[PDB]
């Protein structure tokens, strides 16, 4: 079983901090969870949504950093 990640936020590509969480392949199913489900970047927060199914595709969503006005 192999894992892959995708962004579920329109127009936002995955950052390296998310790609660094990709699990290893499972040897010859239930997905391996990422080590953490929230990643902070300079621009905001990425949150793991879920896997959909062997290839497991894990969707991450982005929330921009809050602005103060």
Domain boundaries, the chain: 2-64
Burial class (CB within 10 angstroms; exposed 0-12, middle 13-18, buried 19+) of 11: exposed
The C-alpha atoms of residue 32 and residue 47 are separated, in whole angstroms, by 16
CA 9 to each of CA 13, 28, 32, 68: distance values in angstroms, whole numbers, following the listed order:
8, 32, 22, 22
**Which resolution, in Å, applies to this structure?**
0.9
Helix, coil or strand: residue 1: coil
Work out the angle at residue 49's Cα, subtended by the Cα atoms of residues 35 and 52, and round it to the nearest 5 degrees: 95
């Amino acid at each position: 079983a192999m894992h892959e990640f995708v962004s579920g936020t329109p127009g936002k590509e995955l950052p390296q901090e998310v790609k660094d969480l990709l699990p290893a392949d499972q040897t010859d199913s239930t997905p391996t969870q990422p080590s953490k489900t929230e990643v902070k970047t300079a621009e905001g927060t990425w949150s793991f949504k879920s896997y959909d199914k062997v290839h497991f595709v894990g969707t991450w969503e982005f929330t921009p950093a809050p602005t103060y006005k």
